[PDB]
Amino acid sequence: QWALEDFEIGRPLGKGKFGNVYLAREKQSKFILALKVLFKAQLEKAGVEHQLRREVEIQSHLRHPNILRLYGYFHDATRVYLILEYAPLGTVYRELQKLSKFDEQRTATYITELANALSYCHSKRVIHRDIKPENLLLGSAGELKIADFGWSVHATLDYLPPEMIEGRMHDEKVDLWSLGVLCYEFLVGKPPFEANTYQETYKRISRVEFTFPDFVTEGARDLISRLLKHNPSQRPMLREVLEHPWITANSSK
Ligand SMILES: CS(=O)(=O)NCc1cccc(-c2cn3c(Cl)cnc3c(Nc3ccc(N4CCOCC4)cc3)n2)c1
């Protein structure tokens, strides 16, 4: 199907691990989209070959307003190319760097959009596992879109749960933890388990050792405390999250 000469390449949108993402336009269509360039060299050296196969396989088959479309793909000699939906308003990450904290209505809305997207993922038995602000994009209307199914599976420590950090076997429940960490970070402006070293953060995650600044409301504290439980079993379902007083009270969607 596609080849590189099918597109005009535009400005760099940002840098990734094995490659960078560019603005691009399909020549015939004048259709605007993001082009993710990966290097066969680096992805072999790190043997993530099998993961890319799952990202491409998984993201290509998902269809949801809050999940970033993968349209197709291709490759040449040196590189692999992902042809992605373009998200005009950037990452939630840069949004967070700019504003410092989010208000309770912006947070609740993102959490809602996120839950929906995740509630759908799980019904198709897909677990993301790598949910973080660099991996959340914004659509033309400012709607949240989950991107980059990198370590997603049909089955740096800041957003991972105790069970994963400690090697153990994990389920759809990892994502509700990540959701808890996100909810906290949106309101406070830094993740609950942040530290100067990986080693400290690890201990802090395993003991679920976090505290709230004074400005965080009882509603926020309750939802977050429910999501951030050491025991996967004790975490709410996506459905209960959507129904949380604090959420329904504050969310616009
Ligand atoms: C500070 S930052 O925003 O550059 N963060 C860096 C970074 C790292 C990895 C992947 C991306 C990335 C991936 N995308 C995919 Cl895939 C589809 N659309 C985008 C997409 N879109 C996008 C749209 C507009 C903007 N800006 C920059 C400053 O504010 C005005 C417009 C940036 C990224 N970005 C961005």
CATH of the domain at 71: 3.30.200.20
- Helix/strand/coil percent split, the chain, to 5: 40, 20, 40
Phi/psi at 228 (nearest 5 deg)?
-90, 55
SS3 86: coil
Boundary residue ending a domain (90, 105, 136): 90
Task: Note whether 168 and 69 are same-domain residues.
Answer: no
How many residues make up the chain in this entry? 253
Nearest to 153 by CA among 14, 70, 53, 37: 53
Q: How far is the CA of 19 from the centre of ligand 1 (A)?
A: 14
Tokens of 213: 């600044």
| Tokens read off for 190 | 């830094």
| Same-domain status, 115 and 229 | yes
| Same domain flag for 48 and 97 | no
Q: Are residues 83 and 105 in the same domain?
A: no
On whether both 98 and 223 belong to a single domain, the answer is yes
Q: How many domains does the chain have?
A: 2
Task: Confirm or deny that 20 is annotated as ligand binding.
Answer: no
**Residue 21 · residue 70 · CB < 8 Å:** no
d(CA 15, CA 59) in angstroms, rounded, equals 20
Q: Choose the final residue of a domain: 38, 71, 90.
A: 90
Instruction: Clarify whether residues 100 and 127 are in a common domain.
Output: yes
Residue 99 and residue 68 share a domain = no
CA of 84 to the centre of ligand 1 (A): 12
Side-chain half-sphere CA neighbours of 126 within 13 A: 23
Other residues' Cβ atoms within 10 Å of the Cβ of residue 143? 17
- Report the phi/psi class of residue 86: left, alpha or beta, with left for phi > 0 and alpha for psi in -120 to 50: beta
E strand or H helix at 108: helix 104-123
Residues 146 and 195 in one domain: yes
Q: Are residues 61 and 103 in the same domain?
A: no
- 223 CB near ligand 1 (under 6 Å): no
**Do 163 and 237 fall within a single domain?**
yes
Identify the CATH number of the domain in which residue 223 sits. 1.10.510.10
Distance (Å, rounded) from C-alpha 1 to C-alpha 39? Answer: 20
Q: Is the CB of 13 under 6 A from ligand 1?
A: yes
3-state secondary structure of 8: strand
* Alpha-carbon dihedral sign for residues 223, 225, 228, 234: negative
The rounded Å distance from CA 194 to ligand 1 centre is: 24
Tell whether ligand 1 has an atom less than 6 A from the beta carbon of residue 90. yes
Q: Are residues 166 and 68 in the same domain?
A: no
DSSP reduced 3-state for 211:
coil
Q: Which atom of ligand 1 is nearest to the CA of 94?
A: 1
Burial of 180 per CB tally in 10 Å (0-12, 13-18, 19+): buried
- Using an 8 Å Cβ cutoff, are 176 and 238 in contact? yes
Q: Which atom of ligand 1 is nearest to the CA of 93?
A: 5
Rounded to whole angstroms, how far apart are CA atoms 227 and 180? 5
Q: Clarify whether residues 197 and 180 are in a common domain.
A: yes
CA of 212 to the centre of ligand 1 (A): 30
87 in helix, strand or coil?
coil
Q: Write down which residue in 90, 123, 141 finishes a domain.
A: 90
Resolution in angstroms comes to 2.6
Determine contact, residues 227/107, Cβ cutoff 8 Å.
Answer: no
Active-site residue list:
130
Q: For residue 162, what are the domain limits?
A: 91-250
In a mutational test of the pocket of ligand 1, which residue from 13, 70, 95 has the highest number of ligand atoms less than 8 Å from its CB? 13
How far apart CA 233 and CA 226 sit, in angstroms, is 11
